[PDB]
Design a protein around this ligand. Structure first.
Ligand SMILES: Nc1ncnc2c1ncn2[C@@H]1O[C@H](COP(=O)(O)OP(=O)(O)O)[C@@H](O)[C@H]1O
Ligand SMILES: Nc1ncnc2c1ncn2[C@@H]1O[C@H](COP(=O)(O)OP(=O)(O)O)[C@@H](O)[C@H]1O
Lengths: 18, 49, 48, 49, 374, 365, 374
């Protein structure tokens, strides 16, 4: 759960940065 | 070191057992505070009739 | 041997304190038994 | 705490009270430390519902 | 080994740690020091070198001028930095940097150009395929297991407290204080002069740092402990020098770390760490402060003083409102926690998209790191 | 622009004569008036809802004439007798007309078990009452309403014959009365049950009007048959009224309604094994490494080393609580430079001055 | 009147001005700071006071901890204000307070207890014969020659916009916003740390404030100006520090005041100053909108940045309705205007009924100021 939650969170830093 | 290592493993398992008692204490005071306030409100309503 | 002898006595008093702590949490849960029961009794009395 | 309830139409009390409660109470309270506790897929469905 | 695994390198002012991606433990931990000989050398035919690097430099302390390449978290001598990185890649890890990506950590607030330099001498000389730069204190929160909380990291070079909300940091609330373990070592050397013992060279500073690591603790109450030391002599310890002399430091055990909480001893204007993290919390929004009090995480080498957690909790509870609950989080392996966070960040499958490609660097120059790294 | 007023208002009044159950009843009636205004069913001044406080003392509570339903507070209502005389003057300073109370008083003279009487003048209810045939069981709300009675209303209940004609037509046990060309009246033992019946009848009447207008006639309605349909414990309307009081309290309204089942709000927390436990349980100081002990003369004062073998104190502290304690506060800067000049220019002028001499030499001279 | 002139004392949050009524220029303008020594004084005969006030404190910046008695427009140290008033009356002007009336200025929206405390302090200790309290933003319009218009004021404490309609301050439409010069100075530190220049003590805050005063301007278009600054180095200028070092400010010159227009840089969730003025006019009735758009006066210390006038005009044109009369009236002396308005108001013959006598205060306590002065 925690591992794939950070998976998703890093996904939105990609979405959010550019 | 041989009769060290077993002690550290068993005692680490012991803190991880401690923490459940600790946070269930945490829940227990807080629901005392809520139920004691609630009973005080009910007693106030009883006094006001 | 110094590291071993320190760690064992340290969590020995930890285990002693936790056996002490279990009685306290049992007291608190038994207290909630009276809290729930006595509050239910008050609301039943007010429901009359 | 002066919630500042919106004025209503003569036939529009429901809408005004609904938007006042929407201003007061957010529908997504899971944000913060509580967001970890629920599943990622389940939390989004809860928000949608 | 079958697939290329990234290299996680944590590089602070005090020591350098290096390991492989996804590993539990770093492979190499060694002081970040570059030494050069000072005395005349007349022994022809045996081992002499113009410069010593790493743990070998600290082995032969008696014939060197130890020189730290990183000062206050800022790299001031880049040739020694390249020598440290070369000794890290080849002598310790013994793996070529061109096969594997590398991950570096860096301070939150810093000069801009430093990052550019960390780019330029990493692609051009070591010929790495890709790298990434991450803030040091975020990895502590990742390794602790929490996505929301405020973290203090006080290394050997700089102290900084950052609050992170929903795993995504707040830049405006970042507080940075230039008070760390090296200034504590200098203060301890200054106050050890009053008893008669004198320490002046670089090897003596290393010895004083060892004394600080061995016998120091933070008092729960300064006035009560000072009066206790005024009463009896139970607060005395004896340390044996490498010369063979024995010194009794006594009262100074809790005066050296007390400069962390009262920086007026050093003459600095800024106040202690506890009100610093209190102001960092107060700079955030009101709604998120409840999670910030319950998720305070300590990290860094300086935060391994005995009794630091109780004193910190008492001070921050004195500052906090009475209705709020305070929870301090002190990992038993906090000293390495940043590196552990790096090992988490190099194992995520989404992180493969984060890497700065060599072709991208060749297209965009050294300024790619500001837009690519957050 | 903050049109809301506190419904309770018992705090501000500090006057008059009230029974033990008067506070709850006044809060209930004012909350009912607020809910009738806030649904939009009624908006102007009339006497819609009436309450009985004591079964053996009458003293019914009505609304004063000329007050809108949004402006109704608990203290502003008027307590009267069965006949209609103002036995208790309300807090509001308005002229009192107790004409429309008479119909409610006739219904009160009919049934002893009724405590809440609600009258509706909504357009759909009046359209249903004006209709020749009775209310049709064409909706689930109408089925849940139950039985009803129909009585022709001439608009005045002052005559004794009209009052005695209402009593048998109403029936011994009936909850819903329909005044033709005038609307509906609901009778409830409790306020919440009457409110529930009012809401269900209200929904059912727009259902019936819309279906009857769109369909045309009765044949297309395919109406059902009522006969074929046939903590402690809840009493019909407890839960809905409790929820309404809860949400109204969350608006900031002060309602005196106490809750049979109170509400508990807990966030709770899910324990995660990845999370590490919490695991918790001005002045400058000058140090002296030694301690001196006073020893008598062996008079002249003597101080003693007191070395560490004799278990002496380790560290002697000296505290400085303010800066510049060494220098006196009040000082002219010119004086020092003046004295420096005075001392220095005696070198320039090269004096013949010698040091002081002791007085033992002066005595022998 | 003829024999004695009323004392006009403007108590700004950063600076304090004082002079005689009916005069063009204030006699003394000085910073509103109070410093205490931080180091032990060892020279016996040179003379050291307990605390330094005003310009004497700012001369010796290196050995003092500067404290501001006024914080965010709210007094936080009342005896410190007693010190600053004593320094104003006795040292700067050398006139007794018991022989002349005094005039005091205040923020448009302040707590009642603040006014009561000012009146009690001014009557009880200084024993002044007559005093009066005026709104700071009202007197600027009197100095403008106007009686109808919108006044925007921005000092070191707080920035507020008020409408004035033939001398009437509408209480509902007065808007407040926490974008002052001190926050711009703090943001100037926060953006100066990028280049590599570190300022941390309260002494260097005056240096950073002087840098802000001397080398800043407001961009007409931010997006074009960032590209212009990235393209060429013609925007860079050099500043010469008190210790002899030379810094190059470069890009940050139009980044410091931009926090006024976009408060999201500082982390505040509030709207910009242009939106604040627009909403302030929006809250008034329709009839006076035409003469509020056709009449706008800028005042305060912050409003002397070069190029703020055209940017303000463009940003308020972008929000105004079509074919609307828009004009900004900024006097060159816009941050001495409050004292000018105070002296003008004290100069009139029909103003002499505003004075509160000592007998009136003695009869009615400190609460008479609110009834006498509405
Ligand atoms: N066990 C300890 N007790 C007290 N101080 C310590 C301890 N370990 C390390 N330190 C201090 O912390 C410093 C190391 O900090 P570290 O976290 O390694 O810095 P970084 O990792 O940021 O380079 C050392 O210089 C030492 O002064
Ligand atoms: N010539 C100038 N150029 C730029 N900024 C200035 C100038 N003069 C004053 N300021 C700014 O104005 C502020 C002082 O405002 P001030 O007028 O004292 O406020 P108040 O209205 O409270 O008296 C200072 O912080 C300074 O940054």
């Amino acid at each position: 759960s925690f591992r794939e939650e950070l998976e998703g969170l890093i996904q939105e830093q990609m979405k959010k940065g550019n | 070191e041989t009769r060290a290592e077993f002690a550290e493993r068993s005692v680490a398992k012991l803190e991880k057992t401690i923490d459940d008692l600790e946070d269930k204490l945490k829940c227990t005071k807080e629901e005392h505070l809520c139920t004691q306030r609630m009973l005080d409100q009910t007693l106030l309503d009883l006094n006001e009739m | 041997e110094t590291r071993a002898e320190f760690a064992e006595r340290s969590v020995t008093k930890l285990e002693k304190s936790i056996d002490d702590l279990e009685e306290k949490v049992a007291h608190a849960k038994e207290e909630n038994l009276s809290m729930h029961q006595m509050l239910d009794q008050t609301l039943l009395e007010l429901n009359n | 705490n002066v919630p500042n309830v919106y004025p209503a139409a003569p036939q529009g009390g429901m809408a005004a009270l609904n938007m006042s409660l929407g201003m007061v109470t957010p529908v997504n309270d899971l944000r913060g430390s509580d967001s970890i506790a629920y599943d990622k897929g389940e939390k989004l469905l809860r928000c949608k519902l | 080994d079958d697939d290329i695994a990234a290299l996680v390198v944590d590089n602070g002012s005090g020591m350098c740690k290096a390991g492989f991606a996804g590993d539990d433990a770093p492979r190499a931990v060694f002081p970040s020091i570059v030494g050069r000989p000072r005395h005349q050398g007349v022994m022809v035919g045996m081992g002499q070198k113009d410069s010593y690097v790493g743990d070998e430099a600290q082995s032969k302390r008696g014939i060197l001028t130890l020189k730290y390449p990183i000062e206050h978290g800022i790299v001031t001598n880049w040739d020694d930095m390249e020598k440290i990185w070369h000794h890290t890649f080849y002598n310790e890890l013994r793996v070529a940097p061109e096969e594997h990506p590398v991950l570096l950590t860096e301070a939150p607030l810093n000069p801009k150009a430093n990052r550019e330099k960390m780019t330029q001498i990493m692609f051009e000389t070591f010929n790495t395929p890709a790298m990434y730069v991450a803030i040091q204190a975020v990895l502590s929160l990742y390794a602790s297991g929490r996505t929301t909380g405020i973290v203090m990291d006080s290394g050997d070079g700089v102290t900084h407290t950052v609050p992170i909300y929903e795993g995504y940091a707040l830049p405006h609330a970042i507080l940075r204080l230039d008070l760390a373990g090296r200034d504590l070592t200098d203060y301890l050397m200054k106050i050890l002069t009053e008893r008669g013992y004198s320490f002046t060279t670089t090897a003596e500073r290393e010895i004083v740092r060892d004394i600080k690591e061995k016998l120091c603790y933070v008092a729960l109450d300064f006035e009560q402990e000072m009066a206790t030391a005024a009463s009896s002599s139970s607060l005395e310890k004896s340390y044996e020098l490498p010369d063979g002399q024995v010194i009794t430091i006594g009262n100074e055990r809790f005066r050296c770390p007390e400069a962390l909480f009262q920086p007026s001893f050093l003459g600095m204007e800024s106040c202690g760490i506890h009100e610093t993290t209190f102001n960092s919390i107060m700079k955030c929004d009101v709604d998120i402060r409840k999670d910030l009090y319950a998720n305070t995480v300590l990290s860094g080498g300086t935060t391994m003083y005995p009794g630091i957690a109780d004193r910190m909790q008492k001070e921050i509870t004195a500052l906090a409102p009475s209705t709020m609950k305070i929870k301090i989080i002190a990992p038993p392996e906090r000293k390495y926690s940043v590196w552990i966070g790096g090992s988490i960040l190099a194992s995520l499958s989404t992180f493969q998209q984060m890497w700065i490609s060599k072709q991208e660097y060749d297209e965009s120059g050294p300024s790619i790191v500001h837009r690519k790294c957050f | 622009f903050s049109m809301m007023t506190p419904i309770n208002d018992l705090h501000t009044a500090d006057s008059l004569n009230l029974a033990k159950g008067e506070r709850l009843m006044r809060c209930k009636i004012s909350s009912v008036y607020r809910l009738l205004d806030l649904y939009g069913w009624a908006q102007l001044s009339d006497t819609y809802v009436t309450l009985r406080v004591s079964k053996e003392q009458d003293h019914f509570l009505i609304s004063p004439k000329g007050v809108s339903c949004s402006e109704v507070t608990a203290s502003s209502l008027i307590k009267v007798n069965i006949l209609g005389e103002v036995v208790e003057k309300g807090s509001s300073c308005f002229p009192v007309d107790t004409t429309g109370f008479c119909l409610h008083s006739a219904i009160y003279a009919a049934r002893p078990d009724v405590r809440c009487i609600i009258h509706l003048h909504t357009p759909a209810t009046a359209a249903v009452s004006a209709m020749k045939w009775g209310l049709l069981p064409v909706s689930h709300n109408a089925l849940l309403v139950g039985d009803m009675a129909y009585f022709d209303f001439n608009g005045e209940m002052e005559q004794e014959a009209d009052r005695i004609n209402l009593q048998k037509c109403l029936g011994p046990t009936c909850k819903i009365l329909v005044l033709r060309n005038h609307g509906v009246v609901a009778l409830g033992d409790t306020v919440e049950e009457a409110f529930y019946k009012v809401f269900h009848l209200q929904a059912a009447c727009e259902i019936q009007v819309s279906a009857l207008s769109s369909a045309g006639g009765v044949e297309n309605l395919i109406l059902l048959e009522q006969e074929k349909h046939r903590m402690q414990k809840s009493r019909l309307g407890e839960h809905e009224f409790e929820a309404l009081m809860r949400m109204l309290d969350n608006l900031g309204y002060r309602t005196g309604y106490p809750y049979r089942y109170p509400l508990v709000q807990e966030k709770t927390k899910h324990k995660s094994e990845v999370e590490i436990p919490a695991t918790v349980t001005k002045t400058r100081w000058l140090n002296t490494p030694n301690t001196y002990l006073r020893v008598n003369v062996a008079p002249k004062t003597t101080w003693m080393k007191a070395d560490e073998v004799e278990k002496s104190s380790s560290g002697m502290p000296i505290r400085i609580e303010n800066p510049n304690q060494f220098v006196p506060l009040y000082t002219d800067p010119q004086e020092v430079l003046d004295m420096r000049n005075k001392i220095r220019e005696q070198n320039r002028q090269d004096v013949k001055s010698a040091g002081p001499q002791s007085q033992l030499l002066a005595s022998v001279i």
